[PDB]
């Protein structure tokens, strides 16, 4: 039980994460969609001492979409919270920013929401 | 890469970052005052081989708002792009999620935008 483990989003992407004692998130992300192939490095942070009132655990992480196979010149950040329970879940909102010219900056950023579970949908 | 160094937003916050050869962003986010109680660990990633057509360099980072002195039970992610030159900028949009109960989850996430420059 906890953040550390292998998670899958509603699209079948694979989020392999370790939550360190210092508040660090490290691991790999493999996307089922987009200009992406195989695993990408991720790093992030999480609240290592969450409230004890029934609230979830805040967290966030980033993937820059460059690996040894492809480079999409873009990065996604997920911001969200881990919710413990019978079926543990990480509920997130995300921003995907692509590198653009100034004239195209208005359309540089996609927004969405991903929910992660330790069971693959 | 032009990213390593100290950046200032439009509201008096400061971050110091190192952009590693491997695409890592590592540093500290603080207030203009810079007292220890206002400093937090920052980590993220950037495109270490951006396009050469005039496009910006995509990047993102996270700060969880816990340090040795306080804990807001929340985390912000900034997603954006670095634009180089004499007037270098990091243009971002951000998401600040607080830990909530499920009944309050609908109001868990704030959204906004920050522009960072190398000058106060």
Swiss-Prot record, chain B:
The GO molecular function terms of this record are: biotin binding
Annotated motif Cell attachment site: location in the chain? 45-47
Q: What keywords sit in the KW lines? A: Biotin, Secreted, Signal
Task: Tell me the residue numbers annotated for binding biotin.
Answer: 29, 40, 78, 94, 106
The residues covered by the Avidin-like domain are 1-120
> Keyword Oxidoreductase: yes or no?
no
The reply to whether Secreted figures as a keyword in the UniProt entry is yes
**Where is this gene product found?**
Secreted
Q: Name one GO cellular component term.
A: extracellular region
Q: What does this protein do?
A: The biological function of streptavidin is not known. Forms a strong non-covalent specific complex with biotin (one molecule of biotin per subunit of streptavidin).
What does the subunit comment say? Homotetramer.
Identify its protein family: Belongs to the avidin/streptavidin family.
Protein name listed in UniProt? Streptavidin
Taxonomic lineage of the native organism = Bacteria, Bacillati, Actinomycetota, Actinomycetes, Kitasatosporales
Q: What range of the parent protein does this fragment cover? A: 39 to 158 of 183
